[PDB]
Amino acid sequence: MVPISPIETVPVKLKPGMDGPKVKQWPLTEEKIKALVEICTEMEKEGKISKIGPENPYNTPVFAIKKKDSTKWRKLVDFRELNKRTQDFWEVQLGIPHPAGLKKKKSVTVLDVGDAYFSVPLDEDFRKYTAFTIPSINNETPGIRYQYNVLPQGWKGSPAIFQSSMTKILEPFAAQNPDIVIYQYMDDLYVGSDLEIGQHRTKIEELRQHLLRWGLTTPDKKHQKEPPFLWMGYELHPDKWTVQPIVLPEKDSWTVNDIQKLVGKLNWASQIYPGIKVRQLSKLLRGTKALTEVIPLTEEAELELAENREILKEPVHGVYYDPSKDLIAEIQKQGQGQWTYQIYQEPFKNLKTGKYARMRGAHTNDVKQLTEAVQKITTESIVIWGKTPKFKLPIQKETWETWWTEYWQATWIPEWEFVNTPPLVKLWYQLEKEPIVGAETFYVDGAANRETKLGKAGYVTNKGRQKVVPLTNTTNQKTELQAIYLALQDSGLEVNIVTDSQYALGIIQAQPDKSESELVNQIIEQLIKKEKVYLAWVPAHKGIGGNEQVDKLVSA
Amino acid sequence: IETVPVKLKPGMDGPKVKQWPLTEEKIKALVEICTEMEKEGKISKIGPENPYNTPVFAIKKKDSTKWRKLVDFRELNKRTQDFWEVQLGIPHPAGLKKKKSVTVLDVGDAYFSVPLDEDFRKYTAFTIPSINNETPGIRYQYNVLPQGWKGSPAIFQSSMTKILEPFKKQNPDIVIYQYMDDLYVGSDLEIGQHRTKIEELRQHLLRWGLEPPFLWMGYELHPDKWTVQPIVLPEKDSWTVNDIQKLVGKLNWASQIYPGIKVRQLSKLLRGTKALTEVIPLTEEAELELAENREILKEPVHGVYYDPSKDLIAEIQKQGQGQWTYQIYQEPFKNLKTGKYARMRGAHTNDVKQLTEAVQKITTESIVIWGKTPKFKLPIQKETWETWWTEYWQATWIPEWEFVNTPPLVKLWYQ
Ligand SMILES: Cc1cc(/C=C/C#N)cc(C)c1Nc1ccnc(Nc2ccc(C#N)cc2)n1
Ligand SMILES: [Mg+2]
């Protein structure tokens, strides 16, 4: 016989202070027992399990499950209790490749490594924790006791230990053959290359020879599976990729659960189908989690669905990554906090697409949202391709310069160019840095009684213009915004406004162009119509003239 | 040659921090660095029974052509036992901040000469990711004291005092302070003599070494000339209504820091409902109050003391045109240091690079003055900071930070 290198075992421990499982074996039918005894005799003949004596105090339940539509039984060892007690492992699939970062391949062969899948040795000191018992016929003898010698399917550590063991085996082959790629998924090896199929099939044979060094045999009759591969919800082809078919159902009535399924499919589709939208369809799941409740579809959601159906009418494919070319990312504003993007290298050949949704917040503006979309695309691109794409953005260079230079926060977006495709992101207003000569000065104030919720808002100006409005169902903060609104409404095109409201100043200094508060939205609409606005803050209750006067008027 | 036993704090598992996305160039750099470190025995590959992780990346230190590995041990440092087996601490040298020149040396490579306790090594696990996760990340752990871990200078301290015993008695007026991987060396000599003694010092550790990749560098500070920012009021011949409003606003703010500040007489100049741009003559009760406030503002703040048991907090404001102001404090309105920068280099079109350089300079000042790093309140969205700061980082330590999302009114007053 040819000596084979043994696979070093991974040392395994229970979580600190825990003992192994001691779970009672369910009684089984005479029929199931005989099936389990034969199953285990074969497994024992192959070395996967060994009989043990009654010393071992651990136990895990074993079951016999009928393969649907067959006389054959199947053995199921239920490791749920041992898994709770087994240490955590390093999981290496804490991240799956995205197809858009893959490289085009001339050939991809699949090799079956199922016979190593069930042949990696288990740490000798841990085997005792895997003990199980086949019950005896009529319970008149001791059950037959076994423990595992190899990684058991369904045990918490098996996928991580199997993958780390196969990786270690493959590492020198991959290192000395940099003209191929190897990827392990379940019990298959996928080997791709750009080699002429002769050389490619040579490497495949050399890989089979390399695997034999560990006694890992691979089937001769070449694998059933060929390109295209169905994998992780995608279709992988030699030179393009797509998501598996997305078919949106027809329904007269939509439950909560159908709406969740629909949004999930749309989100999946949005990585290659450009322009997918889900805002209005997601708005219907707001708050409620009664998974069988039927919801009427707003005209808005009906329109979104219609748009999406058109986008999904015919198949769309992505191309693979060419590392010799720049990556370009183009972003469009879609409305209602929705943004969409495409990443490509050649015009009209996307690598992938995607979308970004406005964060939940009280106030916002387009420039902040575009900025966040850029950071998210940047980070996703680092993951997929290891580099930042060049951006094509619907915002003028002068607009960005004005924004970043005057914004109170530090902010930055990487190398980008203006793309003139409406709707453009713009600054809807900018406050003055200095008081305006010749513009009327409005001293504004508001106050409310917290008990009654009654209040007043108003202003007095240097021209003697004055207004006070009585208000109901209001708060101090709302009346301070109302006062600013009244000053904007009643002034000319240029105006100086003096407030003592730290709250209003905090909002306006954030430069919103849209708010959840309809009062803030009205202020924004007034600001957009002005030519010049200077907003000045003073401390309250300091006898500041004009301020003190309207404070008395409104707090009465 | 023998390992000091090290433990985590009680009821505390090892770090399990997720590796952040790395660019292709940083990955390739880390693969080269770690291949060599593994050959030299400093790190070893680990298996899946080790579930711990600490992030890693790579930097190019100030003025260099070579990548440096930087492990972000912030989480492991929080979870590692405190170190007062031999030393309750190294009482921080108050003379360091008074020297005319301080040079900062990267001496972290010396730590690679001491083995790490075999039972603690697992907690130093890290991963070199692969682009698009196409191949399994390369997993390693340290066999020797790692750079950036708080235990490393502690365990190496006995070694380090012995190496510099000669240089210290030969130069008894030089202050030497070690923080993490840095050695701070302060002299009052002229900079040419200073540079010589620094190179003198480098030779001791080259000799003891028998090669350190970044020992030859020197970051030169002159804490002698470090400037502060008292509160100052405008001196004007004509005051508009707007000017006086801003003055009363600033003085009201200052009165939270300085008790005896008054605004009553200044407020009385406002009273009418006047145009903002109208010039107001100062009455004399107002001029006197203003002069009294000016003199109050020339004195130090009352009851300001440093407490080594409390965190230092650093706040930063963007002032525009490349200018940044900052304050270091432990209690609100009790500033231990204030300051202002403008020379943010190589960043006139990049706010985030400028902020990152400010953070590093403030941290350096904090280390020199108190021997610890502050917690930053950063005027930036978390997603923007987290995407970019590692591109501009050149220090071998990393402080803690949080994010300010509401605009501070007080930015005006530090301007
Ligand atoms: C991640 C991955 C999944 C599968 C397969 C999973 C399946 N199931 C197969 C392979 C070979 C890989 N690994 C890589 C790595 C780099 N480029 C590529 N390009 C590439 C891969 C597949 C096809 C196909 N045709 C075309 C190009 N694949
Ligand atoms: Mg008031």
Curated annotation (Swiss-Prot), chain A:
- Motif mapping: Tryptophan repeat motif: 400-416
Which residue numbers mark the site Essential for RT p66/p51 heterodimerization? 403, 416
As for subcellular location, the record says: Virion
Q: What is the effect of changing residue 264 to A?
A: Complete loss of polymerase activity. 25% loss of RNase H activity
- The coiled-coil segments of this chain are none
Q: What is the effect of changing residue 403 to F?
A: No effect on RT p66/p51 heterodimerization
Quaternary structure and partners: Heterodimer of p66 RT and p51 RT (RT p66/p51). Heterodimerization of RT is essential for DNA polymerase activity. The overall folding of the subdomains is similar in p66 RT and p51 RT but the spatial arrangements of the subdomains are dramatically different.
Q: What is this protein called?
A: Reverse transcriptase/ribonuclease H
Species the sequence originates in: Human immunodeficiency virus type 1 group M subtype B (isolate BH10) (HIV-1)
Q: Which part of the full protein is shown?
A: 600 to 1153 of 1447
